[PDB]
Design an enzyme around this catalytic site. Structure first.
Site, PDB file in Angstrom:
ATOM      1  N   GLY A 297       7.744   4.844   3.362  1.00 20.36           N
ATOM      2  CA  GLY A 297       8.370   5.809   3.752  1.00 20.36           C
ATOM      3  C   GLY A 297       9.783   6.027   3.745  1.00 20.36           C
ATOM      4  O   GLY A 297      10.451   6.210   2.871  1.00 20.36           O
TER       5      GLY A 297
ATOM      6  N   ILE B  72       0.760  -1.401  -0.040  1.00 22.25           N
ATOM      7  CA  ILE B  72       0.161   0.041  -0.050  1.00 22.25           C
ATOM      8  C   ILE B  72       0.942   1.289  -0.099  1.00 22.25           C
ATOM      9  O   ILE B  72       0.438   2.174  -0.632  1.00 22.25           O
ATOM     10  CB  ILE B  72      -1.158   0.131   1.133  1.00 22.25           C
ATOM     11  CG1 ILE B  72      -0.289  -0.276   2.502  1.00 22.25           C
ATOM     12  CG2 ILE B  72      -2.043  -0.949   0.967  1.00 22.25           C
ATOM     13  CD1 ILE B  72      -1.532   0.054   3.507  1.00 22.25           C
TER      14      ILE B  72
ATOM     15  N   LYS C 293       3.378  -2.900   9.340  1.00 17.98           N
ATOM     16  CA  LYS C 293       4.464  -2.203   8.936  1.00 17.98           C
ATOM     17  C   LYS C 293       5.924  -2.919   9.673  1.00 17.98           C
ATOM     18  O   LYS C 293       5.767  -3.292  10.834  1.00 17.98           O
ATOM     19  CB  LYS C 293       4.551  -0.873   9.785  1.00 17.98           C
ATOM     20  CG  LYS C 293       5.709   0.013   9.613  1.00 17.98           C
ATOM     21  CD  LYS C 293       5.686   1.605  10.023  1.00 17.98           C
ATOM     22  CE  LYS C 293       7.181   2.262   9.821  1.00 17.98           C
ATOM     23  NZ  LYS C 293       6.492   3.796  10.250  1.00 17.98           N
TER      24      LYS C 293
ATOM     25  N   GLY D 278      10.008   2.078   7.493  1.00 18.13           N
ATOM     26  CA  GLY D 278       9.771   0.654   7.258  1.00 18.13           C
ATOM     27  C   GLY D 278       8.751   0.772   5.885  1.00 18.13           C
ATOM     28  O   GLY D 278       8.060   1.629   5.639  1.00 18.13           O
TER      29      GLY D 278
ATOM     30  N   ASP E  34       7.410  17.819  13.747  1.00 21.55           N
ATOM     31  CA  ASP E  34       7.696  17.250  12.603  1.00 21.55           C
ATOM     32  C   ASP E  34       6.420  16.706  11.670  1.00 21.55           C
ATOM     33  O   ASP E  34       6.411  15.493  10.994  1.00 21.55           O
ATOM     34  CB  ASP E  34       8.675  16.248  12.335  1.00 21.55           C
ATOM     35  CG  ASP E  34       9.442  16.175  10.991  1.00 21.55           C
ATOM     36  OD1 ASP E  34       9.384  17.177   9.959  1.00 21.55           O
ATOM     37  OD2 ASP E  34      10.054  15.203  10.740  1.00 21.55           O
TER      38      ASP E  34
HETATM   39  C1  LIG Z   1      -1.351   5.269   3.567  1.00 26.12           C
HETATM   40  C2  LIG Z   1      -2.127   4.216   3.204  1.00 26.12           C
HETATM   41  S1  LIG Z   1      -2.833   3.913   1.618  1.00 26.12           S
HETATM   42  C3  LIG Z   1      -3.949   2.575   2.043  1.00 26.12           C
HETATM   43  C4  LIG Z   1      -4.713   1.937   1.422  1.00 26.12           C
HETATM   44  O1  LIG Z   1      -4.488   1.696   0.135  1.00 26.12           O
HETATM   45  N1  LIG Z   1      -6.066   1.095   1.788  1.00 26.12           N
HETATM   46  C5  LIG Z   1      -6.987   0.491   0.618  1.00 26.12           C
HETATM   47  C6  LIG Z   1      -8.235  -0.233   1.325  1.00 26.12           C
HETATM   48  O2  LIG Z   1      -7.576  -1.656   0.935  1.00 26.12           O
HETATM   49  C7  LIG Z   1      -6.537  -1.018   0.523  1.00 26.12           C
HETATM   50  C8  LIG Z   1      -3.860   2.396   3.327  1.00 26.12           C
HETATM   51  C9  LIG Z   1      -2.879   3.245   4.139  1.00 26.12           C
HETATM   52  N2  LIG Z   1      -2.501   3.063   5.590  1.00 26.12           N
HETATM   53  C10 LIG Z   1      -1.340   3.157   6.141  1.00 26.12           C
HETATM   54  C11 LIG Z   1      -1.366   2.905   7.225  1.00 26.12           C
HETATM   55  N3  LIG Z   1      -0.363   2.708   8.583  1.00 26.12           N
HETATM   56  C12 LIG Z   1       1.078   3.202   8.110  1.00 26.12           C
HETATM   57  O3  LIG Z   1       1.574   3.837   7.006  1.00 26.12           O
HETATM   58  N4  LIG Z   1       2.353   3.019   8.848  1.00 26.12           N
HETATM   59  C13 LIG Z   1       1.864   2.166  10.284  1.00 26.12           C
HETATM   60  C14 LIG Z   1       1.295   0.824  10.207  1.00 26.12           C
HETATM   61  F1  LIG Z   1       1.100   0.028   8.896  1.00 26.12           F
HETATM   62  C15 LIG Z   1       1.434  -0.090  11.288  1.00 26.12           C
HETATM   63  C16 LIG Z   1       1.585   0.526  12.468  1.00 26.12           C
HETATM   64  C17 LIG Z   1       2.318   1.728  12.589  1.00 26.12           C
HETATM   65  C18 LIG Z   1       2.423   2.561  11.384  1.00 26.12           C
HETATM   66 CL1  LIG Z   1       2.781   4.058  11.741  1.00 26.12          CL
HETATM   67  C19 LIG Z   1      -2.617   2.533   7.536  1.00 26.12           C
HETATM   68  N5  LIG Z   1      -3.490   2.684   6.497  1.00 26.12           N
END
Ligand SMILES: Cc1sc(C(=O)NC2COC2)cc1-n1cc(NC(=O)Nc2c(F)cccc2Cl)cn1
Length: 346
Positions: A29, A26, A49, A32, A145
């Protein structure tokens, strides 16, 4: 029989508990790689992550440890909450990776910024960022930040901040995004809670203009973009800078700065009805009060929540919550590895 299984997601191998199925890429950064997955135990979609060797260097280790400890502390609907934490390795000697699990969102705020948003969605997203920052400030956490890539949203407009901000050298290709940092961070100046209001202003301004407000290769170009648009700061602000930086800042050309109607014209807002004309003037008014170089004159989080563009979403149940130690020491790879391993194994 094996508790874990491994699957390839691009260049990254994800070794996860068998409850997590149908892993798909998905986003990613720097700290991770991230995947979407179906959690067969909770019967819901999650984001996973991977933190690869978080103990490898001081910068990676400090962030991994701090965010694991702070995540268990804070409890807010607009701040990330983990569903699970796990390592596939069975001992400290074998310990390599940490996997963090959270609710699956739909997009990061960078994607949202690209779209034209009505005032209803724009103000609701700003309201939630301010509620999240208020909760962080009540827990003694001043972020410094805050940026769009670390903010996520769902289709229903709900929002969550993913990180806890600043605590320096990195041998990786990924360079950090510094465009949302406040003048006090850019100029090493000392700061209060409203340092984060500058970042909300940069985000809000970018939502309207669809372009980063203060770009630059480094802080030199970035400071030029700040003074060219907002104007040279007052002498009261100049007296609060350290001598060497003060000399640099006072010797740049003088800029009067552009007015907020000129920085954010009516063309960028949906200004058709009397309802939307008022909302656009209120949105410009809030931008005028957040994008203020001097933090003594910049609006606070509490006053930003009371601004007429934001207070239409107010509710005692989510604006306030019961608040709740203090770690910041340098360590060897081995010591950091054990500190993070103990935190993963509660
Ligand atoms: C940015 C996008 S795009 C998208 C998407 O495409 N959803 C469609 C619906 O089915 C596929 C989903 C997300 N998304 C990202 C996070 N978490 C983190 O980035 N970090 C993160 C993590 F993963 C786990 C723990 C800590 C951290 Cl900090 C949650 N949701």
């Amino acid at each position: 029989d094996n508790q874990f299984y491994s699957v390839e997601v691009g260049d990254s191998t994800f070794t996860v508990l068998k409850r997590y199925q149908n892993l798909k890429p998905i986003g990613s950064g720097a700290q991770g790689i991230v995947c979407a997955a179906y959690d067969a135990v909770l019967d819901r979609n999650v984001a996973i992550k991977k933190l690869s060797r978080p103990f490898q260097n001081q910068t990676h280790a400090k962030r991994a440890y701090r965010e694991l400890v702070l995540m268990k502390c804070v409890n807010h609907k607009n701040i990330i909450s983990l569903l699970n934490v796990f390592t596939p390795q069975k001992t400290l000697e074998e310990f390599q990776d940490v996997y963090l699990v959270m609710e699956l969102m739909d997009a990061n705020l960078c994607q949202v910024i690209q779209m034209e948003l009505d005032h209803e969605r724009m103000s609701y997203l700003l309201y939630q960022m301010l509620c999240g920052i208020k909760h962080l400030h009540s827990a003694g956490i001043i972020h410094r930040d805050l940026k769009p890539s670390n903010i996520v949203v769902k289709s229903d407009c709900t929002l969550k901040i993913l990180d806890f901000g600043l605590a320096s050298f990195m041998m990786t290709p990924y360079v950090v995004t510094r465009y949302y940092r406040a003048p006090e961070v850019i100029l090493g100046m000392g700061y209060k809670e409203n340092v984060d209001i500058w970042s909300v202003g940069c985000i809000m301004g970018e939502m309207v203009r669809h372009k980063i407000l203060f770009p630059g290769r480094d802080y030199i170009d970035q400071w030029n973009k700040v003074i060219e648009q907002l104007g040279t700061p007052c002498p009261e602000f100049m007296k609060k800078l350290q001598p060497t930086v003060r000399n640099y800042v006072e010797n740049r050309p003088k800029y009067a700065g552009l007015t907020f109607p000129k920085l954010f014209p009516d063309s960028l807002f949906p200004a058709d009805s009397e309802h939307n004309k008022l909302k656009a003037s209120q949105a410009r008014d809030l931008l005028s009060k957040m994008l203020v170089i001097d933090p003594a004159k910049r609006i606070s989080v509490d006053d930003a929540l009371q601004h007429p563009y934001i207070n239409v979403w107010y509710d005692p149940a989510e604006v306030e919550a019961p608040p709740p130690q203090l770690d910041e020491r340098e360590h060897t790879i081995e010591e950091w590895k054990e500190l993070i391993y103990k935190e993963v194994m509660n």
